[model samples]
Target chain A: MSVSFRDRVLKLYLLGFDPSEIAQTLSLDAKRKVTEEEVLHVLAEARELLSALPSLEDIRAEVGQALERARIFQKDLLAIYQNMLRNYNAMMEGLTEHPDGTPVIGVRPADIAAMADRIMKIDQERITALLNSLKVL
Target chain B: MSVSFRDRVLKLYLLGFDPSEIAQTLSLDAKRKVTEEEVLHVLAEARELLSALPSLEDIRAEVGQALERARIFQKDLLAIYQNMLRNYNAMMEGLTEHPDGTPVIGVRPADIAAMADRIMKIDQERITALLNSLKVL
Candidate 1:
């Protein structure tokens, strides 16, 4: 795993995933270009380290900066969702029920409901991927 | 727990989380609104059901739709990133290292490097959250 790989894993972990879950998340990519052991190691080291004794004020400062970053990106994310809705609608305009129109035949109702889950998870994973790649540019 | 709560849990599970991990993710919110038992029950039932006998073509069709969905969001996501870069630049244009950089002093250098992880993870989680909330509106 590269440095950014560790970064991504730690990000997810900080967001509340344990190393075990992250192990699978990273390993699921391209036949484990990042091994489970690598993920385990990175996080093991990261936790002991992030257990810093920094003042809350300093952490607060970083938190504020992150929130501003969140606000900036939040506006853009909503815009993106709205734009995708249009794409979804345009695509669906032609999606009349053939009586057998889609994969819904096999998908349960809850599965259909959970479709938004896929989109957003991919969004989270991909955005990190994009930003990390961009930094190296 | 509402219906969409289960939907969100299932989505994360589909993204490859074990029931054990999702328990923490959902439960970590505002004190056990979603209990570990609930997450465990939901995923256990879900896996058994999704082990359906769908045809390969149907799975492929759904996969294709998701990819198109990814493209739609990807274009929007990148545009959002560019816009945020503008914000980041504007904010940073005023930044100086007079020594302490917001939080770098209390932080290890590696922690500094991992900052991008926070922004992107928030985007992913927030995007889904915003959309689901909007649907109720």
Candidate 2:
């Protein structure tokens, strides 16, 4: 009554029938002969699925390790950002005057700009790598 | 009363003092004038930490995404393996012999070995990439 072919095969095997007997029984039940090739095809599909299990398990563990590392690093990164913000604001507020009374910039404007540029590039590359992981084998 | 220079600097700023005043106060308190270079050095340290923040955050997000992808793929791989196992055993029991006497091996042993080797390489590469992501910039 619409049972899966796999289930039917297993049931026949459990009943002590060999492959030929199983096929003949199925054929009789359906009023048609079942081809050996069809039976083998199902078995082949099962074999392929069976072989992939261990690899999947291994990948799961690997991903878990990677996630833990990423999470720890993220916390450190957040702390670094907070410290950087404090320093940036303090520096901005602490600008000094030169001999002629012009304000002295201790941290170069170019240096700040360069830092920003580098951060953007890092952002782009990191995103690209993540996207690749999603679609790549 | 061994106060850190960083805390002293922040305290002075909090009290509405300028950089010169902060330096002067520290010098008077410690009985030694703090050089402009020393003040600048502290600021530079802060700046370096600040600049790294954005890149760190980006990397954190990238790793999170990669881990998610790996997790999803692992599930699919497991399902495939389960299906393959069922099919493989079913087929093994259903093998047909040649007319004379020998049984037919539809999937060659060599083919299985080759397939296994290919899968092993793929598994190795995937794990290597995951490990590299953990340590790489």
How far residue A118's Cα lies from its native spot in candidate 2, in Å, is 30
Docking class of 2: incorrect
Worst 10 residues of 1 chain A by lDDT: A104-113
- For the second chain, the TM-scores of the candidates in order are 0.33, 0.37
lDDT of 1 by residue, A24-89 (tens): 876776453555677788888888978879763444343333323444454555575454444433
Candidate DockQ scores, in order: 0.01, 0.02
lDDT of 2 by residue, A35-123 (tens): 76666566566567566755543443434334333444545554554444444334434435544565543442223333333333343
For model 1, what is the C-alpha lDDT against the true structure? 0.50
Residue B77 displacement (Å), model 1: 18
Model 2 chain B worst lDDT window (10 residues): B46-55
| lDDT of candidate 2 over B32-83, digit per residue (tens) | 6887666556644533332222344565665566455445434433443343
Tens digits of per-residue lDDT, candidate 1, B1-137, equal 55767567766764567666787877776555666688878765554444333343443343344345545644544443443344344445554322223311122334323334433544565465446335522
True contacts kept of each: 0.00, 0.02
- Point out where model 1 deviates above 4 Å: A1-137, B16-21, B28-32, B55-137
